[PDB]
Design a protein around this ligand. Structure first.
Ligand SMILES: Nc1ncnc2c1ncn2[C@@H]1O[C@H](COP(=O)(O)OP(=O)(O)NP(=O)(O)O)[C@@H](O)[C@H]1O
Length: 216
């Protein structure tokens, strides 16, 4: 009938598609997420190809989207808001961890403002549930760093304010493959410059992840 999707964060009605590899996200407030997908498609298709989950189509108010967790045996997922919050400063300065797999088990609260110490430990907690193998964690961090690097670089040439967008970090329990993608275009806007706020979010995450990958 209807299988509801294991969101890691956010408020939206998201369900498994009737078919493999798809989730349906309801647009609650407006069709702005759909208008923005189609804008990015026409003006920046390379950005869409590399970083954004595929939009397969629309069914009334629902978006048929690529399930990012589909190709994984045991996904571990972390949602980090890197674009500006509606009102409210970021819980970790330049970004906000909205949640992660097993966050309850480390008494993570999305409203708690965090020192640089807490922030790092919460990312380390995210890495624990697979991790263990010291240098499968390095390979996961380094592959995330590789992609966020290209993303931070590519953002300089993109005239959008990425208000409210998130990074979805995934890795498998048996620390093989991993990925990070940009999601949630519902409050994204056109502007005549780049988004220095969102760039600082990504560069800061790159800094934090590099520190963990170098850590002995
Ligand atoms: N393409 C995707 N593949 C897999 N999981 C996804 C995908 N898109 C969204 N999610 C999951 O859904 C959660 C929230 O959906 P998101 O697209 O961020 O918007 P939202 O629900 O409108 N949030 P908000 O209005 O700020 O409360 C994420 O934290 C992920 O766990």
């Amino acid at each position: 009938s209807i299988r509801i999707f294991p969101r890691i964060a956010g408020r939206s009605y998201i369900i498994y598609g009737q078919t493999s590899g798809i989730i349906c996200k309801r647009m609650e407030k407006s069709d702005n997420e759909f208008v923005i997908y189609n804008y990015i498609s026409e003006h920046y298709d390379k950005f869409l190809k590399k970083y954004v989950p595929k939009l397969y189509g629309k069914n009334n108010d629902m978006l048929l989207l690529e399930d990012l967790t589909y190709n994984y045996n045991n996904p571990n997922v972390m949602d980090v808001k890197i674009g500006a919050r509606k009102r409210k400063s970021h819980t970790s300065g330049f970004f906000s961890i909205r949640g992660y797999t097993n966050s309850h088990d480390y008494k993570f609260d999305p409203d708690e403002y965090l020192t640089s110490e807490s922030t790092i430990n919460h990312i380390k907690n995210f890495m624990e549930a697979g991790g263990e193998n010291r240098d499968k964690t390095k390979q996961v961090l380094l592959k995330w760093i590789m992609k966020l690097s290209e993303l931070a670089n590519d953002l300089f040439e993109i005239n959008l304010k990425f208000d409210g967008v998130s990074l979805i970090f995934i890795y498998d329990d048996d620390c093989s493959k991993c990925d990070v993608n940009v999601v949630d275009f519902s409050r994204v806007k056109l502007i005549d410059t780049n988004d220095q706020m969102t760039i600082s979010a990504v560069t800061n995450l790159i800094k934090i992840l590099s520190e963990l990958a170098d850590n002995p």
